[PDB]
Amino acid sequence: SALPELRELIASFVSEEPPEIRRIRTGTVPDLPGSYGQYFTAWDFSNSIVRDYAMNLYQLTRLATDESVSVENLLTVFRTLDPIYSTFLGYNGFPVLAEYAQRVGQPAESRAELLDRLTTFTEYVNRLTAWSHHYFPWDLGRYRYLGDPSQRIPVRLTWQPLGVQVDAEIYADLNPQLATDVLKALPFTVLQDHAVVSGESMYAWAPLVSVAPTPVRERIPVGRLRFSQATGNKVIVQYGPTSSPVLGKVVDSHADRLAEVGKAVWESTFSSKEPVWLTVERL
C-alpha cells in the first residue's frame, strides 16, 4: 500500500478495541468534546460521523474505479468533501484518522494509487465504525413503542462466547465477484454486533473492501447470509423478520441455533458490551 502502518492498525483492530474508541466511550477524549458538563453528545457525534464518513469513503472508492471520472478530478471531490468530516473527527476522538485523510488527498501517480489509499483508509475507518457501533449505549430507548448445487461452498460460522456453531453454503455463482472476495478473507474472526434499526438481524464487519458488482439482491429466508458493501463490507445473518446482496444461507437444520445467538448479540450490542465473536471459515 502507499502507507503500510494503516494495515498494521487494521490487523490489530479486528482483535483489539482501538484506543481512540476507548477514550470516546470512557470520556477521556482530549479537548473534552461535549457541552455543559457532558460528553454524550460528542459520543453521538463520534459514532454518527465515523459511520457516514465511512459510507462516503466507500462510495468515493467505488467512484475511483469509474474511468469516466479523472483521477485529479476525484482528488478534488475528496478534497472538497473530506475536511468538513475529517477535521471534526480529529477533534472528536479520531485524530490519526485525520492525518490519513490528509494523506489520501495527496496527488496520486496512479489511479491505483488513490484506489489503494481509499481502500486502506476506508477499511481502517470501517473497522473504527464497527467498534464505535459496538460500544455506543443504544440502551436509552423512555422511547418504547436457483444457482448451481456445485457452486455452493461449505462454510462454518462459530460464536466462541456463545459456543454455538452452524454450517452454511456460500453461493459463488449468484454474486461471483462478491463471494470471491469474502472467500479470500476467510478464515477470519471478527466481532459480532446487532442490527439496531432494521430488526432481528446481525452484522460483523468483514476484513475486506470490495466494490464487486451485486447483480443478485433480495428483501432484507431465516438464516440468510447477506453482504452489505455500502454499509461497511458487513456479513449479515438474519435470525428473524426485519435490497442487499446474497452470499448464501445457514443450513436449515442449524437455522434453529441462531435464535439464542440473536438474543445474545442483541444484548452484546445493546447492554453488555460483552463481545460475541464470529468466526467464518471454509469447510
Q: What are phi and psi of 218, to 5 degrees?
A: -145, 175
Are 50 and 247 in contact by the 8 Å Cβ rule? The answer is no
Q: Please give the Cα distance from 270 to 255 (Å, whole number).
A: 23
The binder of 200, among a copy of itself, ligand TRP, none, by C-beta within 5 to 8 A per type, is a copy of itself
Among 14, 21, 60, 258, binds a copy of itself (CB under 8 A): 60
Which one-letter amino acid corresponds to residue 43?
W
Q: Name the packing angle between helices 83-91 and 71-81 (round to 10°).
A: 40
Q: How many residues at the interface with a copy of itself, by CB under 8 A?
A: 63
Among 45, 53, 100, 124, binds ligand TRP (CB under 6 A): 45
Question: Is 135 a residue that touches ligand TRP (CB under 6 A)?
Answer: no
Q: Please give the Cα distance from 212 to 11 (Å, whole number).
A: 22
Q: Residue 4 or 37: which CB sits closer to a copy of itself?
A: 37
Pick from 83, 76, 108, 80: nearest CA to 97: 83
Among 48, 106, 110, 177, binds a copy of itself (CB under 8 A): 48
Enumerate the β-bridge partners of residue 282.
Answer: 155
Write the binding mask 169 to 208 for a copy of itself: x where contact by CB under 8 A, - elsewhere: -------------------------xxxxxxx--------
The binder of 95, among a copy of itself, ligand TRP, none, by C-beta within 5 to 8 A per type, is none
Query: Which three cell numbers mark 196?
Result: 439496531
- Tell me the CB-side half-sphere exposure of residue 172, using CA atoms within 13 A: 13
The binder of 161, among ligand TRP, a copy of itself, none, by C-beta within 5 to 8 A per type, is none
Q: Residue 60 or 153: which CB sits closer to ligand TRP?
A: 60
Query: Which three cell numbers mark 228?
Result: 452489505
CB of 244 to ligand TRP, least distance (A): 8
Among 32, 84, 112, 251, binds ligand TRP (CB under 6 A): 84
Q: Which residues contact 55 (CB under 8 A, 6 or more apart)?
A: 230, 231, 232
Query: Which three cell numbers mark 117?
Result: 489509499
Instruction: Label residues 248-280 b or e (16+ Cβ within 10 Å = b).
Output: bbbeeebbebbeebbebbbebbeeeeeebbbbb
Write the binding mask 171 to 200 for ligand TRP: x where contact by CB under 6 A, - elsewhere: ------------------------xxxx--
Question: Is 88 a residue that touches ligand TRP (CB under 6 A)?
Answer: yes
> For the chain, what is the radius of gyration of the CA atoms?
19
Q: Residue 44 or 113: which CB sits closer to ligand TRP?
A: 44
Strand 234-238 to 224-228 pairing: antiparallel
Among 18, 33, 105, 207, binds a copy of itself (CB under 8 A): 33
The binder of 283, among ligand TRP, a copy of itself, none, by C-beta within 5 to 8 A per type, is none
Write out the residues near a copy of itself by the rule CB under 8 A. 27, 31-45, 47-49, 51-53, 55-56, 59-60, 62-63, 66, 68-70, 72-73, 76-77, 80-81, 84-85, 87-88, 91-92, 137-138, 140-145, 194-200, 230-231, 266, 270
